[PDB]
Amino acid sequence: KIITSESVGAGHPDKICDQISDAILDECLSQDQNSRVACEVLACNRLIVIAGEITTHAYVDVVKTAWEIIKPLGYDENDFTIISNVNKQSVDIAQSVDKTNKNLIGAGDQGIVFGYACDETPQYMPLTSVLAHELLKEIERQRRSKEFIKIQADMKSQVSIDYSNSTPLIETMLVSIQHDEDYDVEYFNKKVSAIMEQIAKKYNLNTNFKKIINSSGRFVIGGPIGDTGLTGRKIIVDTYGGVGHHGGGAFSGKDPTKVDRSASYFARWIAKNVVAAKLAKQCEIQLAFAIGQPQPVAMYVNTFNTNLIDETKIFEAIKKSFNFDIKTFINDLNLWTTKYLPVATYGHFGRDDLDLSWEKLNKVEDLIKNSKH
């Protein structure tokens, strides 16, 4: 039984787009917390089109902001044309979300979001996901600091784990990194091999696993240059690298009124606190929404027969422990005042390197109280 997860670096075309989308969002929320943002980005060859709907009192040069994401990766003013066709939000959607009564907020769209957690890691995330991110996250750190030279930002990881026996085993770690023409392969493979082992030993896993380093054998042309990138085409890499289910919504470039995002975060927060409360080893939460309605239309809790108390009492504890009003859980998770660029890379979930509201175990003591009466 082999389960596999993937991640992509800051220089991946899709992740360039996700970063530019959240960077524009962050710049909007800083000035106007009441601003509606649905920012999509196409990066095709040397053309970057910034698009979507934005209504805001904020002054934002969308193009200037794109260049600030792009120079670090590190392209210059000669590398791209960057044009904006950014429109305004539909007044038809706005009337349904922003009520006349100032006290409810209605769902930004219809949709289904999944929240997942498990006890396999301190991050309460599947091992394969954590290892795939941490690998690229360490490589990108060394590239910016020049501890790992003659590599560029574009890169991918795939970590396969053999779950046959109850103690997990690393089967394969795969890495593709964009490199310079004049790289030393010895140096390159040693650097990658060392990072792969340092990471395996961190989660005290076997160290003898198969290492697949630049399997294509040439990776100089990266980024959008041969290629295409769009906002929200890495939604499984943003979440639970499979292991969990997904409803289809992308996160980057969307303000908190888009339930696709804020409800997904809210769902992560329940799942994580349920497993942290030791009520289950794995927990998946499905939430469904209707456009303009203030509360979820349907909710499903699945503990995968890893529940350590009665399944039914877990459903009750959650209903008693969490407010499901959309304006309320948005304020509770402080989504108006959270910077989203940091989660545009290396996953939205299990960020022990960040301090995200939806990762805090501040509901464990309420779930324990409400599972018993």
Q: How far is the CB of 322 from ligand ATP (least distance, A)?
A: 23
Among ligand ATP, its own copies, none, residue 299 binds (CB under 5-8 Å by kind):
its own copies
Residue 223: what are its φ and ψ, rounded to 5°?
50, -155
253 part of the interface to ligand ATP, by CB under 6 A: no
Among its own copies, ligand ATP, none, residue 290 binds (CB under 5-8 Å by kind):
its own copies
Would you give the binding string for its own copies spanning residues 164-203, x where CB under 8 A is met? -------xx-x-x---------------------------
CB 363 within 8 A of CB 273: yes
Percent helix, percent strand, percent coil in the chain, to nearest 5: 35, 25, 45
Q: How far is the CB of 361 from ligand ATP (least distance, A)?
A: 29
Q: How far is the CB of 277 from its own copies (least distance, A)?
A: 22
Residue-wise burial string across 356-369, b where 16 or more C-beta atoms lie within 10 A, e elsewhere: bbbbeeebbebbee
> Where does the chain have alpha helices with state H?
13-31, 62-70, 91-97, 127-145, 185-202, 259-276, 311-321, 326-332, 364-370
CA distance 292 to 216: 48
Q: How far is the CB of 340 from ligand ATP (least distance, A)?
A: 15
Q: Which stretch binds ligand ATP (CB under 6 A): 57-65, 122-130, 201-209, 221-229?
A: 221-229
Among ligand ATP, its own copies, none, residue 12 binds (CB under 5-8 Å by kind):
ligand ATP
93 part of the interface to its own copies, by CB under 8 A: yes
Question: Which one of residues 58, 104, 288, 291 is an interface residue with ligand ATP (CB under 6 A)?
Answer: 291
Q: Which is nearer to ligand ATP, 14 or 27 (CB)?
A: 14
List the one residue out of 331, 333, 372, 324 whose CA is nearest residue 356.
Answer: 333
* Positions in 155-194 near ligand ATP (CB under 6 A): 156, 176
Helix (H, G, I), strand (E, B) or coil at 194: helix
Among ligand ATP, its own copies, none, residue 286 binds (CB under 5-8 Å by kind):
its own copies
Q: How far is the CB of 290 from its own copies (least distance, A)?
A: 5
Burial class (CB in 10 A: 0-12, 13-18, 19+), 238: buried
Q: How far is the CB of 42 from its own copies (least distance, A)?
A: 4
Among its own copies, ligand ATP, none, residue 154 binds (CB under 5-8 Å by kind):
ligand ATP
List the one residue out of 71, 125, 73, 82 whose CA is nearest residue 345.
Answer: 73
CA distance 53 to 108: 13
Within a 10 A sphere around the Cβ of 289, how many other Cβ atoms?
25
Question: Which one of residues 12, 36, 133, 272 is an interface residue with ligand ATP (CB under 6 A)?
Answer: 12
**How many H helices and E strands in the chain?**
9, 11
Ramachandran area for residue 165 (φ above 0: left; ψ -120 to 50: alpha; else beta) = beta
Burial class (CB in 10 A: 0-12, 13-18, 19+), 232: buried
Q: Which is nearer to ligand ATP, 122 or 248 (CB)?
A: 248
- One-letter amino acid identity for 359? E
55 part of the interface to its own copies, by CB under 8 A: no
Size of the site for ligand ATP (CB under 6 A): 28
Q: Which stretch binds its own copies (CB under 8 A): 60-68, 81-89, 318-326, 336-344?
A: 81-89
Structure tokens at 357: 């509201």
233 part of the interface to ligand ATP, by CB under 6 A: yes
List the one residue out of 67, 39, 68 whose CA is nearest residue 55.
Answer: 39
Q: Which stretch binds ligand ATP (CB under 6 A): 80-88, 195-203, 232-240, 364-372?
A: 232-240
Give the residues lining the site for ligand ATP (CB under 6 A).
12-14, 38, 90, 92-93, 96, 109, 111, 154, 156, 176, 216, 218-219, 222, 226-227, 232-234, 248-250, 258, 260, 291
